[PDB]
Amino acid sequence: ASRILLNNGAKMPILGLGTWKSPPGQVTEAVKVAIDVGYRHIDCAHVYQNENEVGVAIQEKLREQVVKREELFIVSKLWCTYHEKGLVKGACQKTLSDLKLDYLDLYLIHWPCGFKPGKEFFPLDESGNVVPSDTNILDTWAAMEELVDEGLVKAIGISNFNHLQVEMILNKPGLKYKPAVNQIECHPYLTQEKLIQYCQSKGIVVTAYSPLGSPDRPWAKPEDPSLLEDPRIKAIAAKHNKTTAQVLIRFPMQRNLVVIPKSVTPERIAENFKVFDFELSSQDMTTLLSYNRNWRVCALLSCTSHKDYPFHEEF
Ligand SMILES: NC(=O)c1ccc[n+]([C@@H]2O[C@H](COP(=O)([O-])OP(=O)(O)OC[C@H]3O[C@@H](n4cnc5c(N)ncnc54)[C@H](OP(=O)(O)O)[C@@H]3O)[C@@H](O)[C@H]2O)c1
Ligand SMILES: O=C(O)COc1cc(F)ccc1C(=S)NCc1ccc(Br)cc1F
Ligand SMILES: [Br-]
Numbered sequence: 364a365s366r367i368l369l370n371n372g373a374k375m376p377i378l379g380l381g382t383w384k385s386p387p388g389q390v391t392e393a394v395k396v397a398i399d400v401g402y403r404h405i406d407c408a409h410v411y412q413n414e415n416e417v418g419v420a421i422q423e424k425l426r427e428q429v430v431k432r433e434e435l436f437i438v439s440k441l442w443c444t445y446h447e448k449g450l451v452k453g454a455c456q457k458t459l460s461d462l463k464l465d466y467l468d469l470y471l472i473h474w475p476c477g478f479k480p481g482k483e484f485f486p487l488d489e490s491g492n493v494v495p496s497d498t499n500i501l502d503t504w505a506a507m508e509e510l511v512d513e514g515l516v517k518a519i520g521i522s523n524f525n526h527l528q529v530e531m532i533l534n535k536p537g538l539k540y541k542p543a544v545n546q547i548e549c550h551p552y553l554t555q556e557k558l559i560q561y562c563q564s565k566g567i568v569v570t571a572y573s574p575l576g577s578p579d580r581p582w583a584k585p586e587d588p589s590l591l592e593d594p595r596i597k598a599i600a601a602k603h604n605k606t607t608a609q610v611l612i613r614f615p616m617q618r619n620l621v622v623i624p625k626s627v628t629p630e631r632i633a634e635n636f637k638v639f640d641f642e643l644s645s646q647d648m649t650t651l652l653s654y655n656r657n658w659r660v661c662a663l664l665s666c667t668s669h670k671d672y673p674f675h676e677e678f
Pocket of ligand 3: 474475476521666671672673
């Protein structure tokens, strides 16, 4: 089953292409290849600095009539320096302009934290701490709701919100649109059982980011654990005559999650899509869940004193 129904009534493809770290000179081909081989969901963000090049690919495939716009599911995210009532619409509009779109299928609050507006994506004080904004998640959510009502986006959601932050949104006085999605890091070393059950119980669809452990994250260290090289996962893959990456992508799918592996390698883009023709057993699923070590790979010291930094909590 290729798509999941969201609480806005739209269907979202459970497999999408990630674009963080995709070089601007390789991402246009990556997205063209992805669409040619069946991807219909692309995960984007202004902060990734490559939306223009992603958009060139999307627009060419639309112009070529490889796909119709209604068949694509394009996601982007509001960066932390735009949490301000008077900046949200322009941030969304800049993303739309870059992507060559007249609407997004889904627009996420990228991180719960607002930062001081300006040119810099991570404004710092003289001692290296991020400079916050005083605007809270509830007022930012109201600004997101306006984008739905203006026709710029078909769905809104959140990313990297912890349990209490999701609850804060759900409990917002005068809430108009519930979040459709919470996009969070999830893989066998960070299985997220608590947060996923909370969000799914509320009808919020969870998207798993970094499903391969983000081996190209810029802060990787040689000593860090490696999902793709874990011999226990390789053994499950061998049993199914699949690659380790294919197991790592199928895993979240069978948990009723959406998953967004990144690649700029054409061969891997195609491989990663070939995950609809095999089934992990319940025992395989529980075995993969057993590898949890609460390891994130996506965390940032400079932001840990922000009042809304999400990973102080437990989930
Ligand atoms: N919401 C947020 O805060 C947030 C944070 C992080 C990530 N994300 C989203 O999630 C996406 C995926 O996460 P990620 O980029 O961190 O990492 P990932 O998808 O876990 O891993 C990407 C890495 O895996 C490699 N790879 C891909 N397919 C492979 C295969 N079949 N075999 C071997 N290696 C393979 C890629 O190499 P090549 O590209 O060289 O092929 C790249 O180095 C991001 O791109 C972004 O769209 C969102
Ligand atoms: O964020 C991504 O999608 C992927 O990661 C990034 C992608 C970028 F293009 C630039 C920075 C990041 C970083 S450093 N993200 C971590 C991060 C940012 C903000 C806060 Br609050 C906490 C935190 F942990
Ligand atoms: Br944050």
